[PDB]
Design an enzyme around this catalytic site. Sequence first.
Site, PDB file in Angstrom:
ATOM      1  N   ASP A   1     -12.926 -18.984 -16.846  1.00 24.46           N
ATOM      2  CA  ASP A   1     -14.344 -19.314 -16.798  1.00 24.46           C
ATOM      3  C   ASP A   1     -15.121 -18.137 -16.210  1.00 24.46           C
ATOM      4  O   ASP A   1     -14.808 -17.673 -15.116  1.00 24.46           O
ATOM      5  CB  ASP A   1     -14.563 -20.575 -15.958  1.00 24.46           C
TER       6      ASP A   1
ATOM      7  N   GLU B   1      -9.509   6.901  -0.157  1.00 18.76           N
ATOM      8  CA  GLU B   1      -8.135   6.416  -0.185  1.00 18.76           C
ATOM      9  C   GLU B   1      -7.591   6.561  -1.602  1.00 18.76           C
ATOM     10  O   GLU B   1      -6.629   5.893  -1.981  1.00 18.76           O
ATOM     11  CB  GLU B   1      -8.054   4.958   0.275  1.00 18.76           C
TER      12      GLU B   1
ATOM     13  N   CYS C   1     -11.139   1.833   3.369  1.00 27.17           N
ATOM     14  CA  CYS C   1     -12.561   1.716   3.119  1.00 27.17           C
ATOM     15  C   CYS C   1     -13.403   2.168   4.282  1.00 27.17           C
ATOM     16  O   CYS C   1     -14.652   2.095   4.199  1.00 27.17           O
ATOM     17  CB  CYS C   1     -12.936   0.334   2.686  1.00 27.17           C
TER      18      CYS C   1
ATOM     19  N   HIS D   1     -19.797  -3.644   4.393  1.00 30.99           N
ATOM     20  CA  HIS D   1     -18.735  -3.306   3.467  1.00 30.99           C
ATOM     21  C   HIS D   1     -18.301  -4.601   2.805  1.00 30.99           C
ATOM     22  O   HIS D   1     -18.250  -5.644   3.454  1.00 30.99           O
ATOM     23  CB  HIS D   1     -17.521  -2.705   4.160  1.00 30.99           C
TER      24      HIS D   1
END
Length: 387
Positions: free
Chosen positions: A33, A83, A115, A237
Site C-alpha cells: 500500500d 559514512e 549520521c 536528523h
Amino acid sequence: STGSMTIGIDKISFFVPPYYIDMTALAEARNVDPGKFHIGIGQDQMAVNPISQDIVTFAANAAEAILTKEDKEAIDMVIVGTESSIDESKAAAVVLHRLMGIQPFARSFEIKEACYGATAGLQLAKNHVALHPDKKVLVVAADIAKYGLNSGGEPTQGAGAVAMLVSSEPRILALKEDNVMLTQDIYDFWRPTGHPYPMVDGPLSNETYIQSFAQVWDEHKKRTGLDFADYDALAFHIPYTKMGKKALLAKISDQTEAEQERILARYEESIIYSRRVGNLYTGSLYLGLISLLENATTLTAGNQIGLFSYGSGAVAEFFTGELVAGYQNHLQKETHLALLDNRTELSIAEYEAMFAETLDTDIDQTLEDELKYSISAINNTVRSYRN
C-alpha cells in the site's frame, strides 16, 4: 548589535542527483500500500544516483553553489563528514579541496561517526573561526544511502550532500555555546568493513534515537533552563520524516497545545525537502535546516532554532542557532526548488537498472555523464572528475 562577534553558518546549500523515483510507483512495484511509504514513514520522492556519481560529485556540486573567490582564499580548513567513504586512508576532503580551488595552506580531513559526522565538523569549524575570525571553514555532509532492491530499508534510501560555509559575522545562523553532547555504545546501526549495506537492529534504532533526543534535551533544559516555549523551531536528523515526528511528539506531550501546534507546524516545514529526497545520512539534519528556512514564511531574525543531530552507534548532540538580520536574502530557494523540479523521474525498471550497476574500481574505464564533477575515468583505482 552588541557583545562578542558572532560565529556560524554564513551560507548553506544542498545537492542531490538529477534522478528520482516516485514512492507510489515503488509501492506498486513492491506490492505494498502506497500509504505505507507516504504516511507510514513519510516519504514521497526518493533520490537515486548512477555509478558515475559519488560523494565527491555531490560535495563538489553543493560547495560550488556557495563559494566565491574570496571564500576560497579565506578557507584554511576543509572537512567532509560521511559514512559512504570511497577510500580507507585518503580523506574525501582532499579531492574536494582541489576541485573547489581552495588556497593550499589549509588542512583537509574526513570525519566518521554515522549520521553525526558533519555536525562534528560544524562544531570544530565554529571553534576554529572563533579563534581565527578572519578565516573560514568549508564543512560538507555527503552520503549515499542504499539498502537494496526489495529490501526492508529501500523506501528510506537517498543520496546527496549539504555544504556549509562557517565564518564570523555569519549571514544566516549564529551558533550559541549551549552544546549538549552524548555518547552511548549501542549497536543499533553499523556497517563492518566489507559490507556494502548497513547492519541494522530496527527496533533498537528507533528506540535509541527517540531516547537520545530525550536525554540531550533534558540535560540541555537542566543546564540552560530553556524549554520548548523558548524555541521558535526545532530541526532534527531523521532516518525518515515520521521517525523525527515520533521523537518530537514523545518529548513535547506535556506542553500546552499552543506550543505543540507551533513546534509541530515548524517541523512540517523542516521536512518539505526531505520528503522529496530521502535519507542523506550526515546531511539530513542540515537539509532540514535549509528546508525550514526556505519554506517557513513567519520565521524572522532573532528567532532561536534548536538542532538535534544524531549518529547511530550512537552519538547525539543538541545545540542552538539564532537567525541573523537579513538572512532571508542569503538562501537559495529558487535554486533548490529548480534542482528538485528539474530531476528526471525514473520508472522502476530504469531505477532498478541504475541501482544494480556496480562500480569496479579495479578495472580501468571511462564513464559518461553530463553532470559537472561526475566521474570521468578510473585509472589504477584513481577516480578522475570532469570539471
